[PDB]
Amino acid sequence: CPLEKALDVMVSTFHKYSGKEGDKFKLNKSELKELLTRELPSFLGKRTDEAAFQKLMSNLDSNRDNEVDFQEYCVFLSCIAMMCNEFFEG
Amino acid sequence: CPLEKALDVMVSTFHKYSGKEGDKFKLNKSELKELLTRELPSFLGKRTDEAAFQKLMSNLDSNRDNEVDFQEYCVFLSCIAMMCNEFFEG
Numbered sequence A, B: 001c002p003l004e005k006a007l008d009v010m011v012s013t014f015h016k017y018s019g020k021e022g023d024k025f026k027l028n029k030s031e032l033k034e035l036l037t038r039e040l041p042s043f044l045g046k047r048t049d050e051a052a053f054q055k056l057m058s059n060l061d062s063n064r065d066n067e068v069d070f071q072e073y074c075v076f077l078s079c080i081a082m083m084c085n086e087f088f089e090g
């Protein structure tokens, strides 16, 4: 069923990228950018530079540790899901 | 991409069941029971009765309104993803 497939992909996608550099269960700035470019390309705006990307990183990383953990990653995904829920995305 | 479709599917699955009866943007008892049974079957335990089910309902229904809105449904989904993000589910 797509929903369990969907939940599984959501979890899977986190590790596919988190365990490449450093802490294997957190996404560093480099790991987060590849995940967004490769997996959520439909959502990217027109600014692809590191400065623009850094602003976003700062938004997700609640506990301020220059990394995005799984908890933080789900929050982000839910925020995306809710945004897509409105009449007009944004 | 997998993650994008996954998000799409998380959002649209909600509305495929919530709009069946009454408030079209919230799941009642029947709509939620249908959503779990048809979309998350791998996650079903042994008991299918009303009392075991309403136990789950009341946990999902944070705002006490006897129904599951989209926000509560996202929290539900986040929780499942975290459980799955363990060595032993549960």
Ligand SMILES: [Ca+2]
Binding pocket: A017, A018, A019, A020, A021, A022, A023, A024, A025, A026, A027, A028, A031
């Ligand atoms: Ca990492």
Ligand SMILES: [Ca+2]
Binding pocket: A061, A062, A063, A064, A065, A066, A067, A068, A069, A072
């Ligand atoms: Ca963090």
Ligand SMILES: [Ca+2]
Binding pocket: B017, B018, B019, B020, B021, B022, B023, B024, B025, B026, B027, B028, B031
């Ligand atoms: Ca309803």
Ligand SMILES: [Ca+2]
Binding pocket: B060, B061, B062, B063, B064, B065, B066, B067, B068, B069, B072
């Ligand atoms: Ca509710």
